[PDB]
Amino acid sequence: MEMEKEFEQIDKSGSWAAIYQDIRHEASDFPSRVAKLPKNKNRNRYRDVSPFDHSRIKLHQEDNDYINASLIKMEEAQRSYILTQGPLPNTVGHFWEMVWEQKSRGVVMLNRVMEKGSLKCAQYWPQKEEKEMIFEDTNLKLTLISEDIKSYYTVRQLELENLTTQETREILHFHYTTWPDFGVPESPASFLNFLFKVRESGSLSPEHGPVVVHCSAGIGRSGTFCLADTCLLLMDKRKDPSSVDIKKVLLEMRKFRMGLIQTADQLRFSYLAVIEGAKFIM
Numbered sequence: 001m002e003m004e005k006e007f008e009q010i011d012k013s014g015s016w017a018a019i020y021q022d023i024r025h026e027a028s029d030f031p032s033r034v035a036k037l038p039k040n041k042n043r044n045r046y047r048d049v050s051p052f053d054h055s056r057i058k059l060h061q062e063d064n065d066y067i068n069a070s071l072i073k074m075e076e077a078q079r080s081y082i083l084t085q086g087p088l089p090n091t092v093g094h095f096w097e098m099v100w101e102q103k104s105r106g107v108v109m110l111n112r113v114m115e116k117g118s119l120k121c122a123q124y125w126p127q128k129e130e131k132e133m134i135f136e137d138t139n140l141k142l143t144l145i146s147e148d149i150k151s152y153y154t155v156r157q158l159e160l161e162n163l164t165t166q167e168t169r170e171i172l173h174f175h176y177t178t179w180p181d182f183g184v185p186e187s188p189a190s191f192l193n194f195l196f197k198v199r200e201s202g203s204l205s206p207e208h209g210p211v212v213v214h215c216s217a218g219i220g221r222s223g224t225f226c227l228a229d230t231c232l233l234l235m236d237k238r239k240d241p242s243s244v245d246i247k248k249v250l251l252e253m254r255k256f257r258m259g260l261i262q263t264a265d266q267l268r269f270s271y272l273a274v275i276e277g278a279k280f281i282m
């Protein structure tokens with residue numbers, strides 16, 4: 001079925017919490033023993049969101065190598081993502097240790113710091129060129145280089161060094177800042193437009209490590225961007241274009257990290273995105 005015609009029967013037919021619920025239950029439920037250790041209890045932002053043991057990104061340190069993050073491998077498409085939670089006041093050093101270690105080129109941030117009146121993460125990047133940040137624990141220095149503020153998003157170029165060692169990698173931060181507090185945007189053109197910006201950066205490509213992607217829990221909004229991204233990929237590459245099924249793809253991503261796409265408002269939005277992006281894919 002050509003998604004567009006089933007977007008119709010579904011929206012015509014009044015049923016998303018219908019299909020959302022069908023996705024939920026059929027999803028995978030793996031083990032996450034590392035994340036519940038007592039010793040790791042402050043490192044988690046939420047009680048119900050943790051990384052599965054099998055797909056977790058492991059920090060290369062003698063002490064504690066736990067971070068609440070997960071590696072998402074989409075095989076056919078040939079894309080891997082690092083999904084995660086918004087860093088916490090105390091896990092900011094671990095956040096940047098894992099960008100260093102996995103060799104990523106990009107962080108894609110889909111929320112703001114204070115959303116709905118609360119803090120959804122620590123402000124983990126420098127606000128000024130002149131006042132750099134040092135993560136004494138992980139022995140890393142971070143410095144803002146340049147910074148472009150647009151209407152719908154903000155782009156930043158930063159430098160990550162190993163204090164301990166003298167290596168410098170440049171990092172690009174794509175920040176989505178105009179996602180309303182409640183729901184999902186009324187059009188997907190802005191979202192598609194930011195995605196593409198990220199695709200142009202080198203930030204999602206094979207000669208690099210996987211991009212780190214995050215919101216406040218790392219599941220809802222992050223699941224959306226990724227899902228759109230992987231799907232456009234597949235239509236792009238197949239001999240067979242409406243032979244791309246969002247749901248089966250979503251369920252595959254879901255093999256790696258729990259609860260991606262938190263609401264039915266966001267599934268549906270997912271489908272729009274995708275369809276609208278599949279007119280360029282010309």
Ligand SMILES: N#Cc1ccccc1O
Pocket residue numbers: 074075076077078230234248249252
């Ligand atoms: N890409 C991709 C993908 C989606 C669903 C099932 C298997 C795959 O390799």
